[PDB]
């Protein structure tokens, strides 16, 4: 078996992280407008 | 020469309303300011962008307000 092993055998980038803590938030969607503050 | 659009008047009613699936961790996620304006021989109810709110606040516009 180890004979045999020594002769046989011897993509798409992550995003960046995105962080957004204690700050506020603009929602521009397609039927309604967004808000959100402290 | 220009042209211009203008609203004014005495401020009647400032209701920020609230939307009706609010996000986690904020607080008064607003959707729509409602401003009513009076002025001489005329009134309106107005409905306005969220973003002024903070505008509002800002200039510091309260009741009784021109």
Known sequence: ?38 | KETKEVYEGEVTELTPEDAENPLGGYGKTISHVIVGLKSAKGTKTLRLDPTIYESIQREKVSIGDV
């Open chain 1, 1 to 38: 078996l180890l004979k045999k092993r020594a002769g046989k055998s011897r993509f798409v980038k992550p995003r960046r992280p995105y962080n957004s803590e204690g700050m506020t938030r603009i929602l521009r969607r397609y039927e309604e407008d967004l808000f959100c503050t402290f």
